[PDB]
Amino acid sequence: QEPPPMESPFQREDRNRFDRDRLFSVVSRGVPEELTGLLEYLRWNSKYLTDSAYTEGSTGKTCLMKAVLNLQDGVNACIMPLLQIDKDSGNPKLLVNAQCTDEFYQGHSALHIAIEKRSLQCVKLLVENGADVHLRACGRFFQKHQGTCFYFGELPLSLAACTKQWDVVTYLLENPHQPASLEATDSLGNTVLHALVMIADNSPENSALVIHMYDGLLQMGARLCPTVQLEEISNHQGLTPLKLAAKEGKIEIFRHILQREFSGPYQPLSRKFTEWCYGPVRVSLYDLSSVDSWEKNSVLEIIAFHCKSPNRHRMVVLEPLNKLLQEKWDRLVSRFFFNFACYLVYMFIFTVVAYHQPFGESMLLLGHILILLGGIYLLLGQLWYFWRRRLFIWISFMDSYFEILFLLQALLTVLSQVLRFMETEWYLPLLVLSLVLGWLNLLYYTRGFQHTGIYSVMIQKVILRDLLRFLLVYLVFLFGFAVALVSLSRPYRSILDASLELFKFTIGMGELAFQEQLRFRGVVLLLLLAYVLLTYVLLLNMLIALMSETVNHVADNSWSIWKLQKAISVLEMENGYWWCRRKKHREGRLLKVGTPDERWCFRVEEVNWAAWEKTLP
Amino acid sequence: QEPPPMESPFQREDRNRFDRDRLFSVVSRGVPEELTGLLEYLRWNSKYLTDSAYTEGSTGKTCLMKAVLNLQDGVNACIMPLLQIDKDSGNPKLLVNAQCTDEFYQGHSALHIAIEKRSLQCVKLLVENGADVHLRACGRFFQKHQGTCFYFGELPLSLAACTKQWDVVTYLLENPHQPASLEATDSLGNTVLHALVMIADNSPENSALVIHMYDGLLQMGARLCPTVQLEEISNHQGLTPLKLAAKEGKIEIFRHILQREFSGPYQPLSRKFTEWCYGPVRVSLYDLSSVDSWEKNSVLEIIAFHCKSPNRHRMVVLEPLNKLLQEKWDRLVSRFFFNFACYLVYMFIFTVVAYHQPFGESMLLLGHILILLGGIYLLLGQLWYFWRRRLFIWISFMDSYFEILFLLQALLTVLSQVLRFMETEWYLPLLVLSLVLGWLNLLYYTRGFQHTGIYSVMIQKVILRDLLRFLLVYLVFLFGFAVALVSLSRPYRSILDASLELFKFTIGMGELAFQEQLRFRGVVLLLLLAYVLLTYVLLLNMLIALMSETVNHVADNSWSIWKLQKAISVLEMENGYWWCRRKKHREGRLLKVGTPDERWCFRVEEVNWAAWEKTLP
């Protein structure tokens, strides 16, 4: 059963000497003179305007939403006599503080709909007669999910912020009749700034509008409550608006919240400090509070193992993240090469062991013990990895795959080794399969070099999205045709003993044996020609699918995702090995910039000829 | 350890009755009235303002850079009392002539930073009280390298030129208190015009700005010192700004310095002279001083065997270079065909020798001696080539490759011939390999024809950039799979005795022999199917890599690089054979154009309907 509308000129109301529909008609018309006589009736039968009779059936909406949803040029004259009458009624459950009691509109205020109708005088009239701005609206429609809903943080002030209402925000934020506290929050736990970073998008102009609303609100907060700082207040998720806007991966609002500058007044409420400019070069101290890797939950670790959004790589390229990333990589490239050397010597010992085994006995025993210990060490490394990042396979199936190959290579080689300790055979297929998956596994380390990295990040995503599709559309029809030909032939002794020569005939080297002894030479031939034409058809469909991506690809994204994949290396690399915990090198410099304020900053030296020339007349 | 900033509002200073920090604070505020009493203290303890106490720690920067880096609307009132006080101090090491003694800012002046702050009154105040404009600043930051640096030629005047400061250039160039000589130079050896051609780029508008600054400076030089000519002054590299801008290959500034015209006054300071115009056709005498091939270091030889920049071919197409190139090619096409005939008859004799050898003895001896002498002559030709152009393989690996094929063909055929004189065999593989590399080597001569040239320049670059990548990603995994299958099979007697049928199976003609005797039929089959899928994957990655270039290619560049490759033929062809030195034909005509001036000019007849119509109203 669908939820009813909160208002209609056609769908009146359900039910789930004046009357209720009489009151609804007289408030919907806006005439204020048929309201007379109602007060004496209300005193006569001892009833309230929020009581169960005159209210709505399922939504429970009282008459004031009907009042404010009929505002002729934003004006209704009916609200004030209703407020005066209900004040004369003497009601504990205040009509001004009415909330919609439906599940779909839980706690919805008259004030919210007054904000949505954008009549500043009606909002002023509600707040001057005893409203409350701390009435959240926690219906599931008001939350964020897929479909027809609208999330804005459930607060009247936040709803005022989402709809450009500068004047209304000012008339709410400091009126002495009910102060609208800026650091109030929602039922989800988010603040108003978290609501602004939630409602954003990736378009150039909506983002700019949210930015203008955001820094207007931040200057207003700096003027109102300078003792508290709105930037670091964390939600029920424990996130700053920086961290939350990172987690939902909105590119432009992250860019503005990272780098920004306010001169003169509002100067300590910024995260960029210019040190010296000299022609085209410019050195400015960027802030790095709560973004350095030293802290427990940085923006780096959030953008590494929490975000699910394909703009993530364009998160990374912008300063000051990439400079700090390169500094960490300059610190860690030697230990990365040490891990390279460890893996290479383990691999060469494994390849030597895989040749001569089934003074030679001494080195063979050496290789046996060394591969056993290397497998156990690599397996414990993979176990501590998956203990740490538990949900990452449901974050990035298509980026955790080298970790999967590490894990399966280690477990399969130790399974082969314990099968060697067993008497039973089939240890050689497991050993050679472990060698093959390891030999293909020597491609994560190509992450280290830019020369193979730029050339190598382009393949894996586009191949894994469609090669699996091509293989699993083809295997089913190959099975069906093999069943068909083993039915008709009844070589072709078995189904797989047909599918083998069919697959090798697709390659073309491996011949398939037609039979001229049976009468059905032409039926077999025609069936095989049908196979040929359909295989060519699905092959051409794969080709067209790839020629989509060969024109849709943009080469800047390759550089972007290569730097991102270096980041996904360097966070794990910085965390260090499981068998030796790592002292975390504190980044940035502690420095006096404000007042008795003190921040960690970080210098970069950016040069841009284009902007510097554009300065030059 | 990172070098410190030269200025900060936060990072005060290291150290590596007034005080030093007191002086720094009072000059940074700009207040001029707490400066009193300092002179008596300076006379009391007998100290100078550039002495080791009041200076900076490592940078050594004195107080005047702190003064000029705090210029309120370009104005500071603190400079004059400091200059008066230091004049009263009686200091040999003059504060006005202070230089930063750091390595990173070696010899940096106060005047340079005054120029960068663009306050003409402060620069005037420094120069009127005893500055020096011949104080170069030769820090490594001030030179040109990769990273965060800024090169402008290290001179105050050159730094004034790089930042559009017309008024400041005029106030420096002729003030009678210290003349700024225009023909001064840097520590690298470059002039101001060399700095302007160094700082340029390929964009349309930055180049135009540098052009306007350049010819403004050149007219100013023509007015100031007409006895000297700024155009031909060579640096420590021995280059004109023409030659230097060629060597760094900046396309637009080369175009303007080549063709330019000034009417009325400043007429002899130009390189284009219009002879007669007639409708759409126009004949104008271009200058060719220091660009003809007769001189020792022309722009042609520089653009042939010194430039490392992929805009080089667009250097070539523009007039008057291409007309002079075509005239030289019209002079040399007959001797080019003579070399063609020599190589063809040598090849046909070689192919005849390669058939019947291991009256017939007479012609066989004839062919033996003739191939020996042809190989020795070609080898000495290649030796004199690599004696001449020593660094060209580190200039163009991807354009010297035909010369490499010439060299290897000659040395391999003479190695085969001396192996024939030896008793020992394997001379026939060397002979047939020399024949094959020669037969593929008959493609440089396709340079001569436009019909095969336009069709043939498109292949070599795009194929050599990625075919090597495809081959060397494939060989390693082929080796790994061969090791895998010789491990599992233990045919497959050897690793190469598996890789051969794997490679021929990739072609598909050459069968590979699976084995049904061993139990691991399915493991071998599954491993081979894994090989098939990965080989198809890397093949598709190659295909997508080539479909990048099939849309990125622009057909004008083919014509451009074909004319460039004709140029790289014709310079070497004009130099002549090693065994007969060549008289260099003087180009151009000696002619009277100026006053008692006399230049070599060169006529072209250019027609352009579009510009001629655009003239027509």
mmCIF file with all atom_site columns, C-alpha atoms in Angstrom, chain B residues 317-393:
data_model
loop_
_atom_site.group_PDB
_atom_site.id
_atom_site.type_symbol
_atom_site.label_atom_id
_atom_site.label_alt_id
_atom_site.label_comp_id
_atom_site.label_asym_id
_atom_site.label_entity_id
_atom_site.label_seq_id
_atom_site.pdbx_PDB_ins_code
_atom_site.Cartn_x
_atom_site.Cartn_y
_atom_site.Cartn_z
_atom_site.occupancy
_atom_site.B_iso_or_equiv
_atom_site.pdbx_formal_charge
_atom_site.auth_seq_id
_atom_site.auth_comp_id
_atom_site.auth_asym_id
_atom_site.auth_atom_id
_atom_site.pdbx_PDB_model_num
ATOM 1  C CA . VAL B 1 317 ? 58.153 23.105  -43.313 1.00 0.00 ? 317 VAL B CA 1
ATOM 2  C CA . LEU B 1 318 ? 58.142 26.911  -43.035 1.00 0.00 ? 318 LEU B CA 1
ATOM 3  C CA . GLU B 1 319 ? 59.809 29.216  -45.531 1.00 0.00 ? 319 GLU B CA 1
ATOM 4  C CA . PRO B 1 320 ? 62.669 30.084  -46.276 1.00 0.00 ? 320 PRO B CA 1
ATOM 5  C CA . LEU B 1 321 ? 64.149 26.811  -45.067 1.00 0.00 ? 321 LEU B CA 1
ATOM 6  C CA . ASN B 1 322 ? 62.118 24.442  -47.237 1.00 0.00 ? 322 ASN B CA 1
ATOM 7  C CA . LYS B 1 323 ? 62.753 26.353  -50.471 1.00 0.00 ? 323 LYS B CA 1
ATOM 8  C CA . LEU B 1 324 ? 66.501 26.325  -49.822 1.00 0.00 ? 324 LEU B CA 1
ATOM 9  C CA . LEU B 1 325 ? 66.209 22.630  -48.977 1.00 0.00 ? 325 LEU B CA 1
ATOM 10 C CA . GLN B 1 326 ? 64.435 21.934  -52.267 1.00 0.00 ? 326 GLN B CA 1
ATOM 11 C CA . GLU B 1 327 ? 67.097 23.868  -54.169 1.00 0.00 ? 327 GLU B CA 1
ATOM 12 C CA . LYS B 1 328 ? 69.821 21.773  -52.560 1.00 0.00 ? 328 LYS B CA 1
ATOM 13 C CA . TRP B 1 329 ? 67.799 18.643  -53.307 1.00 0.00 ? 329 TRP B CA 1
ATOM 14 C CA . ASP B 1 330 ? 67.460 19.687  -56.946 1.00 0.00 ? 330 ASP B CA 1
ATOM 15 C CA . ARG B 1 331 ? 71.224 20.049  -56.969 1.00 0.00 ? 331 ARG B CA 1
ATOM 16 C CA . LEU B 1 332 ? 71.818 16.654  -55.337 1.00 0.00 ? 332 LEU B CA 1
ATOM 17 C CA . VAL B 1 333 ? 69.103 14.275  -56.614 1.00 0.00 ? 333 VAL B CA 1
ATOM 18 C CA . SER B 1 334 ? 71.344 13.001  -59.434 1.00 0.00 ? 334 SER B CA 1
ATOM 19 C CA . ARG B 1 335 ? 74.157 12.012  -57.083 1.00 0.00 ? 335 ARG B CA 1
ATOM 20 C CA . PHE B 1 336 ? 71.525 10.484  -54.806 1.00 0.00 ? 336 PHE B CA 1
ATOM 21 C CA . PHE B 1 337 ? 70.443 8.304   -57.732 1.00 0.00 ? 337 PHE B CA 1
ATOM 22 C CA . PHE B 1 338 ? 74.107 7.500   -58.395 1.00 0.00 ? 338 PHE B CA 1
ATOM 23 C CA . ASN B 1 339 ? 74.382 6.198   -54.828 1.00 0.00 ? 339 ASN B CA 1
ATOM 24 C CA . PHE B 1 340 ? 71.143 4.279   -55.489 1.00 0.00 ? 340 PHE B CA 1
ATOM 25 C CA . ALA B 1 341 ? 72.698 2.660   -58.558 1.00 0.00 ? 341 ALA B CA 1
ATOM 26 C CA . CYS B 1 342 ? 75.875 1.776   -56.649 1.00 0.00 ? 342 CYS B CA 1
ATOM 27 C CA . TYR B 1 343 ? 73.917 0.099   -53.854 1.00 0.00 ? 343 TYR B CA 1
ATOM 28 C CA . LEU B 1 344 ? 71.619 -1.733  -56.273 1.00 0.00 ? 344 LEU B CA 1
ATOM 29 C CA . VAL B 1 345 ? 74.420 -3.216  -58.370 1.00 0.00 ? 345 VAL B CA 1
ATOM 30 C CA . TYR B 1 346 ? 76.301 -4.215  -55.201 1.00 0.00 ? 346 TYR B CA 1
ATOM 31 C CA . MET B 1 347 ? 73.137 -5.919  -53.976 1.00 0.00 ? 347 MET B CA 1
ATOM 32 C CA . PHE B 1 348 ? 72.529 -7.808  -57.208 1.00 0.00 ? 348 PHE B CA 1
ATOM 33 C CA . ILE B 1 349 ? 76.129 -9.031  -57.238 1.00 0.00 ? 349 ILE B CA 1
ATOM 34 C CA . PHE B 1 350 ? 75.667 -10.116 -53.606 1.00 0.00 ? 350 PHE B CA 1
ATOM 35 C CA . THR B 1 351 ? 72.494 -12.044 -54.426 1.00 0.00 ? 351 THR B CA 1
ATOM 36 C CA . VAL B 1 352 ? 74.233 -13.738 -57.375 1.00 0.00 ? 352 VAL B CA 1
ATOM 37 C CA . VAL B 1 353 ? 77.155 -14.701 -55.097 1.00 0.00 ? 353 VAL B CA 1
ATOM 38 C CA . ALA B 1 354 ? 74.735 -16.037 -52.478 1.00 0.00 ? 354 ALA B CA 1
ATOM 39 C CA . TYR B 1 355 ? 73.335 -18.727 -54.848 1.00 0.00 ? 355 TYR B CA 1
ATOM 40 C CA . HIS B 1 356 ? 75.855 -20.857 -56.725 1.00 0.00 ? 356 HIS B CA 1
ATOM 41 C CA . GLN B 1 357 ? 79.035 -20.618 -54.668 1.00 0.00 ? 357 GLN B CA 1
ATOM 42 C CA . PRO B 1 358 ? 79.442 -23.408 -52.120 1.00 0.00 ? 358 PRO B CA 1
ATOM 43 C CA . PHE B 1 359 ? 84.021 -19.427 -66.513 1.00 0.00 ? 359 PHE B CA 1
ATOM 44 C CA . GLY B 1 360 ? 81.974 -19.935 -63.369 1.00 0.00 ? 360 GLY B CA 1
ATOM 45 C CA . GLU B 1 361 ? 85.105 -19.813 -61.213 1.00 0.00 ? 361 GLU B CA 1
ATOM 46 C CA . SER B 1 362 ? 86.109 -16.530 -62.885 1.00 0.00 ? 362 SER B CA 1
ATOM 47 C CA . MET B 1 363 ? 82.835 -14.708 -62.183 1.00 0.00 ? 363 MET B CA 1
ATOM 48 C CA . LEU B 1 364 ? 82.716 -16.329 -58.741 1.00 0.00 ? 364 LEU B CA 1
ATOM 49 C CA . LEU B 1 365 ? 86.172 -14.934 -57.941 1.00 0.00 ? 365 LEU B CA 1
ATOM 50 C CA . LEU B 1 366 ? 84.946 -11.611 -59.363 1.00 0.00 ? 366 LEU B CA 1
ATOM 51 C CA . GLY B 1 367 ? 81.977 -11.632 -57.004 1.00 0.00 ? 367 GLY B CA 1
ATOM 52 C CA . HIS B 1 368 ? 84.125 -12.666 -54.028 1.00 0.00 ? 368 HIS B CA 1
ATOM 53 C CA . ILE B 1 369 ? 86.575 -9.790  -54.520 1.00 0.00 ? 369 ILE B CA 1
ATOM 54 C CA . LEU B 1 370 ? 83.822 -7.299  -55.363 1.00 0.00 ? 370 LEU B CA 1
ATOM 55 C CA . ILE B 1 371 ? 81.751 -8.064  -52.252 1.00 0.00 ? 371 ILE B CA 1
ATOM 56 C CA . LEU B 1 372 ? 84.900 -7.835  -50.111 1.00 0.00 ? 372 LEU B CA 1
ATOM 57 C CA . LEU B 1 373 ? 85.734 -4.395  -51.510 1.00 0.00 ? 373 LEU B CA 1
ATOM 58 C CA . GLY B 1 374 ? 82.118 -3.214  -51.331 1.00 0.00 ? 374 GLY B CA 1
ATOM 59 C CA . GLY B 1 375 ? 81.928 -4.230  -47.694 1.00 0.00 ? 375 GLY B CA 1
ATOM 60 C CA . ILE B 1 376 ? 85.184 -2.481  -46.850 1.00 0.00 ? 376 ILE B CA 1
ATOM 61 C CA . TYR B 1 377 ? 84.051 0.708   -48.617 1.00 0.00 ? 377 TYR B CA 1
ATOM 62 C CA . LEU B 1 378 ? 80.649 0.734   -46.915 1.00 0.00 ? 378 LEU B CA 1
ATOM 63 C CA . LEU B 1 379 ? 82.226 0.046   -43.528 1.00 0.00 ? 379 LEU B CA 1
ATOM 64 C CA . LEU B 1 380 ? 84.652 2.950   -43.873 1.00 0.00 ? 380 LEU B CA 1
ATOM 65 C CA . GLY B 1 381 ? 81.687 5.124   -44.866 1.00 0.00 ? 381 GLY B CA 1
ATOM 66 C CA . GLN B 1 382 ? 79.868 4.174   -41.681 1.00 0.00 ? 382 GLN B CA 1
ATOM 67 C CA . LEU B 1 383 ? 83.011 4.743   -39.611 1.00 0.00 ? 383 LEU B CA 1
ATOM 68 C CA . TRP B 1 384 ? 83.405 8.270   -40.941 1.00 0.00 ? 384 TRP B CA 1
ATOM 69 C CA . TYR B 1 385 ? 79.697 8.874   -40.280 1.00 0.00 ? 385 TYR B CA 1
ATOM 70 C CA . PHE B 1 386 ? 79.976 7.886   -36.635 1.00 0.00 ? 386 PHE B CA 1
ATOM 71 C CA . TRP B 1 387 ? 83.231 9.799   -36.301 1.00 0.00 ? 387 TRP B CA 1
ATOM 72 C CA . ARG B 1 388 ? 81.329 12.889  -37.421 1.00 0.00 ? 388 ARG B CA 1
ATOM 73 C CA . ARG B 1 389 ? 78.019 12.666  -35.529 1.00 0.00 ? 389 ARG B CA 1
ATOM 74 C CA . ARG B 1 390 ? 79.144 11.208  -32.219 1.00 0.00 ? 390 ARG B CA 1
ATOM 75 C CA . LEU B 1 391 ? 76.119 11.804  -29.980 1.00 0.00 ? 391 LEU B CA 1
ATOM 76 C CA . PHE B 1 392 ? 73.365 11.229  -32.553 1.00 0.00 ? 392 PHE B CA 1
ATOM 77 C CA . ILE B 1 393 ? 72.293 7.855   -31.148 1.00 0.00 ? 393 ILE B CA 1
#
